[PDB]
Structure 1
Amino acid sequence: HTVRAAGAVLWRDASATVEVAVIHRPRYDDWSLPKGKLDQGETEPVAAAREIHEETGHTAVLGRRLGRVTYPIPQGTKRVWYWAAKSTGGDFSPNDEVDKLVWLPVDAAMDQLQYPDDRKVLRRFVKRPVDTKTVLVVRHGTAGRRSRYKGDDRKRPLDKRGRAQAEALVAQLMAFGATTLYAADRVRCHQTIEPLAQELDQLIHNEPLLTEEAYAADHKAARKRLLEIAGRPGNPVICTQGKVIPGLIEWWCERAKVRPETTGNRKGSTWVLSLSDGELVGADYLSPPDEK
Structure 2
Amino acid sequence: KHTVRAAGAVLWRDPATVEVAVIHRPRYDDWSLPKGKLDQGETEPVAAAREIHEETGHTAVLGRRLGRVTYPIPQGTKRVWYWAAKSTGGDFSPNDEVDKLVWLPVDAAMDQLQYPDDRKVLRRFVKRPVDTKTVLVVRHGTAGRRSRYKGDDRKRPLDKRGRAQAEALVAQLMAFGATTLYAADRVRCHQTIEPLAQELDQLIHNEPLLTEEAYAADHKAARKRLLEIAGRPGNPVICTQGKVIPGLIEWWCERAKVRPETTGNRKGSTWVLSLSDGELVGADYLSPPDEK
- Which range, TM-score by smaller chain? over 0.9
**In structure 2, what is the equivalent of residue 117 of structure 1?**
117
Cα distance change, pair 208–74 in 1 and its aligned pair in 2 (3 A): same
Please state whether the residue corresponding to 1:154 is helix, strand or coil: coil
Q: Shift of the alpha carbon at 1:153?
A: 1.9
Cα distance change, pair 116–152 in 1 and its aligned pair in 2 (3 A): closer
Q: Shift of the alpha carbon at 1:155?
A: 1.1
Q: Shift of the alpha carbon at 1:91?
A: 1.4
Please state whether the residue corresponding to 2:129 is helix, strand or coil: coil
**Equivalents in 1 of 2:17, 2:202: separation in Å?**
32
Cα distance change, pair 236–155 in 1 and its aligned pair in 2 (3 A): same
Q: Which runs of 5+ in 1 are unaligned?
A: none
Q: Shift of the alpha carbon at 1:150?
A: 12
Tell me if the contact between 1:61 and 1:85 (Cα under 8 Å) persists in the aligned partners. yes
Q: Shift of the alpha carbon at 1:131?
A: 0.3
Which range moves more in the overlay, 146-155 or 254-263?
146-155
**Equivalents in 2 of 1:222, 1:170: separation in Å?**
25
Cα distance change, pair 69–111 in 1 and its aligned pair in 2 (3 A): same
**Would you say how many aligned residue pairs link Structure 1 and Structure 2?**
290
**Equivalents in 1 of 2:134, 2:95: separation in Å?**
31
Please list the CA deviations of residues 72-121 of structure 1 after superposition, one character each: whole Å capped at 9, or x if unmatched: 23443221100000001211122331011011110110001011110000
Please list the CA deviations of residues 206-261 of structure 1 after superposition, one character each: whole Å capped at 9, or x if unmatched: 01110000111111111111111001110000000000000000000000010111
Please state whether the residue corresponding to 1:46 is helix, strand or coil: helix
Tell me if the contact between 1:41 and 1:290 (Cα under 8 Å) persists in the aligned partners. yes
Q: Post-superposition, which runs of at least 4 consecutive aligned residues in structure 1 deviate over 6 A?
A: 148-152
**What is the root-mean-square deviation of aligned Cα atoms in Å?**
1.7
Tell me if the contact between 1:135 and 1:273 (Cα under 8 Å) persists in the aligned partners. yes
Please state whether the residue corresponding to 1:153 is helix, strand or coil: coil
Which range moves more in the overlay, 85-94 or 179-188?
85-94
**In structure 1, what is the equivalent of residue 98 of structure 2?**
98
**In structure 2, what is the equivalent of residue 11 of structure 1?**
12
Tell me if the contact between 2:63 and 2:176 (Cα under 8 Å) persists in the aligned partners. yes
Please state whether the residue corresponding to 1:101 is helix, strand or coil: strand
Tell me if the contact between 1:184 and 1:190 (Cα under 8 Å) persists in the aligned partners. yes
Please state whether the residue corresponding to 2:161 is helix, strand or coil: helix
Q: Shift of the alpha carbon at 1:202?
A: 1.0
Q: Shift of the alpha carbon at 1:149?
A: 8.5
Q: Shift of the alpha carbon at 1:146?
A: 2.0
Please state whether the residue corresponding to 1:223 is helix, strand or coil: helix
Report the TM-score, using the length of structure 2 for normalisation: 0.96
Which range moves more in the overlay, 1-10 or 238-247?
1-10
Q: Which runs of 5+ in 2 are unaligned?
A: none
**In structure 1, what is the equivalent of residue 155 of structure 2?**
155
